[PDB]
Design an enzyme around this catalytic site. Structure first.
Site, PDB file in Angstrom:
ATOM      1  CG  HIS A  61      16.647  34.343  37.884  1.00  0.00           C
ATOM      2  ND1 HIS A  61      17.351  34.116  39.048  1.00  0.00           N
ATOM      3  CD2 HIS A  61      17.446  33.919  36.875  1.00  0.00           C
ATOM      4  CE1 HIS A  61      18.523  33.579  38.755  1.00  0.00           C
ATOM      5  NE2 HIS A  61      18.596  33.432  37.445  1.00  0.00           N
ATOM      6  CG  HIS A  91       8.871  34.756  43.075  1.00  0.00           C
ATOM      7  ND1 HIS A  91       9.013  33.855  44.107  1.00  0.00           N
ATOM      8  CD2 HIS A  91       8.493  34.031  41.990  1.00  0.00           C
ATOM      9  CE1 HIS A  91       8.764  32.635  43.659  1.00  0.00           C
ATOM     10  NE2 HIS A  91       8.433  32.712  42.381  1.00  0.00           N
ATOM     11  CG  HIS A  93       6.974  33.185  37.554  1.00  0.00           C
ATOM     12  ND1 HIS A  93       8.239  32.710  37.306  1.00  0.00           N
ATOM     13  CD2 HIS A  93       6.676  32.797  38.818  1.00  0.00           C
ATOM     14  CE1 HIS A  93       8.679  32.050  38.369  1.00  0.00           C
ATOM     15  NE2 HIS A  93       7.750  32.091  39.305  1.00  0.00           N
ATOM     16  CD  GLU A 103       6.609  29.832  36.583  1.00  0.00           C
ATOM     17  OE1 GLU A 103       6.573  29.496  37.782  1.00  0.00           O
ATOM     18  OE2 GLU A 103       7.649  29.816  35.890  1.00  0.00           O
ATOM     19  CG  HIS A 116       4.845  31.312  42.319  1.00  0.00           C
ATOM     20  ND1 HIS A 116       5.746  30.911  41.356  1.00  0.00           N
ATOM     21  CD2 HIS A 116       3.618  30.934  41.883  1.00  0.00           C
ATOM     22  CE1 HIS A 116       5.079  30.311  40.381  1.00  0.00           C
ATOM     23  NE2 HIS A 116       3.792  30.306  40.681  1.00  0.00           N
ATOM     24  CB  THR A 195       8.412  26.978  38.356  1.00  0.00           C
ATOM     25  OG1 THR A 195       8.633  28.295  38.864  1.00  0.00           O
ATOM     26  CG2 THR A 195       7.128  26.381  38.897  1.00  0.00           C
ATOM     27  CB  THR A 196      13.526  28.941  38.903  1.00  0.00           C
ATOM     28  OG1 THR A 196      13.509  28.993  40.334  1.00  0.00           O
ATOM     29  CG2 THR A 196      12.539  29.941  38.378  1.00  0.00           C
TER      30      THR A 196
HETATM   31  N1  LIG Z   1       8.917  29.694  41.338  1.00  0.00           N
HETATM   32  S1  LIG Z   1       8.797  28.830  42.683  1.00  0.00           S
HETATM   33  O1  LIG Z   1       7.858  29.461  43.558  1.00  0.00           O
HETATM   34  O2  LIG Z   1       8.568  27.460  42.349  1.00  0.00           O
HETATM   35  C1  LIG Z   1      10.371  28.897  43.499  1.00  0.00           C
HETATM   36  C2  LIG Z   1      10.439  29.197  44.851  1.00  0.00           C
HETATM   37  C3  LIG Z   1      11.670  29.211  45.487  1.00  0.00           C
HETATM   38  C4  LIG Z   1      12.838  28.925  44.795  1.00  0.00           C
HETATM   39  C5  LIG Z   1      14.169  28.919  45.508  1.00  0.00           C
HETATM   40  C6  LIG Z   1      15.053  30.078  45.098  1.00  0.00           C
HETATM   41  O3  LIG Z   1      14.390  31.303  45.307  1.00  0.00           O
HETATM   42  C7  LIG Z   1      12.751  28.627  43.443  1.00  0.00           C
HETATM   43  C8  LIG Z   1      11.528  28.609  42.791  1.00  0.00           C
HETATM   44 ZN   LIG Z   2       7.752  31.250  41.181  1.00  0.00          ZN
END
Ligand SMILES: NS(=O)(=O)c1ccc(CCO)cc1
Ligand SMILES: [Zn+2]
Ligand SMILES: NS(=O)(=O)c1ccc(CCO)cc1
Ligand SMILES: NS(=O)(=O)c1ccc(CCO)cc1
Ligand SMILES: NS(=O)(=O)c1ccc(CCO)cc1
Length: 257
Positions: A61, A91, A93, A103, A116, A195-196
């Site tokens: 992802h 990570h 996006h 996002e 993030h 957000t995932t």
């Molecule tokens: N994109 S986020 O930072 O909301 C996010 C953080 C942590 C996870 C858990 C799986 O890595 C999923 C989404």
């Molecule tokens: Zn994220």
């Protein structure tokens, strides 16, 4: 099986993750005129001097830089937060083009990418227990715009060739995440979600107002990654962002006048 394509992207997620239509979903558009300065917010503290990065992973992802979270080595406190939140990973996006990728949006503006930094509330003991709590997580979000290069991002850029495909990892020790911050810690905050998938409603979002600048060359290297595994048909890892979701019964607070 979720992803970002026409056949598995954000419009499909609710069929396996019904909280996708929940009351506290992220990201959201940040309407700056409606967001209200909140004098009850305490000073925000980013304390990353003792951070221990370990590894970088292409998870199909995005890519995650992972940290040792067995002690309070890199923590986020203050601002809207009650207690201490420990950094576990960061990570990004990003988009296929510089005009999209973030996002969160700011008065509908989409940035080229969004960082993030993910933290869990230490009172819950582990990340897994924290994601069963309405105040389990804090995510520090930072927008990326394309302009001058970000020196503190370059080490990340230059390791991506070694994690091109899903399932690949590489050592990523002695990386200082402080090099990814802007000068100002002005922010907006609101209660939201991952957000995932699994889209869990556990997150206090802290979104910095000042973007960081990265070069076109830096973001172009993000776009050379692959969603697929080695040996499979190549699908460029681009447009791995969820669009803004309904604000519902929420208010976004500003840390600054
Ligand atoms: N994109 S986020 O930072 O909301 C996010 C953080 C942590 C996870 C858990 C799986 O890595 C999923 C989404
Ligand atoms: Zn994220
Ligand atoms: N609800 S979902 O996004 O996890 C999902 C989307 C699409 C498929 C089938 C196509 O691979 C399976 C799961
Ligand atoms: N791949 S990850 O970023 O979800 C991740 C980072 C760090 C850890 C270790 C937590 O003790 C586990 C998973
Ligand atoms: N906030 S704004 O008016 O600068 C703006 C609105 C709309 C867009 C389009 C999506 O980025 C970009 C900027």
């Amino acid at each position: 099986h979720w992803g970002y394509g026409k056949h598995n992207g954000p419009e499909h997620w609710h069929k396996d993750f019904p909280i996708a239509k929940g009351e506290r979903q992220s990201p959201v558009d940040i309407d700056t005129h409606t967001a209200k300065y909140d004098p009850s917010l305490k000073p925000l503290s980013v304390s990353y001097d003792q951070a221990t990065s370990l590894r970088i992973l292409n998870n199909g992802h995005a890519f995650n830089v992972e940290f040792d979270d067995s002690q309070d080595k890199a923590v986020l406190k203050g601002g809207p937060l009650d207690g201490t939140y420990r950094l576990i990973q960061f990570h990004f996006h990003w988009g296929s083009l510089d005009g999209q990728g973030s996002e969160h949006t700011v008065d509908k503006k989409k940035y080229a990418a969004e960082l993030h930094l993910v933290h869990w509330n230490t009172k819950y003991g582990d990340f897994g227990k924290a994601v069963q709590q309405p105040d389990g997580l804090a995510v520090l979000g930072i927008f990326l715009k394309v302009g001058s290069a970000k020196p503190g991002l370059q080490k990340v850029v230059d390791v991506l060739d070694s994690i091109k495909t899903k399932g690949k990892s590489a050592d990523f020790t002695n990386f200082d995440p402080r090099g990814l911050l802007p000068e100002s810690l002005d922010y907006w905050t609101y209660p939201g979600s991952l957000t995932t998938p699994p889209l869990l409603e556990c997150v206090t979002w802290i979104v910095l107002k000042e973007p960081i600048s990265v070069s076109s060359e830096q973001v172009l290297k993000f776009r050379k990654l692959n969603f697929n595994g080695e040996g499979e048909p190549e699908e460029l890892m681009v447009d791995n962002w969820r669009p803004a979701q309904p604000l519902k019964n929420r208010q976004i607070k500003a840390s600054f006048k």
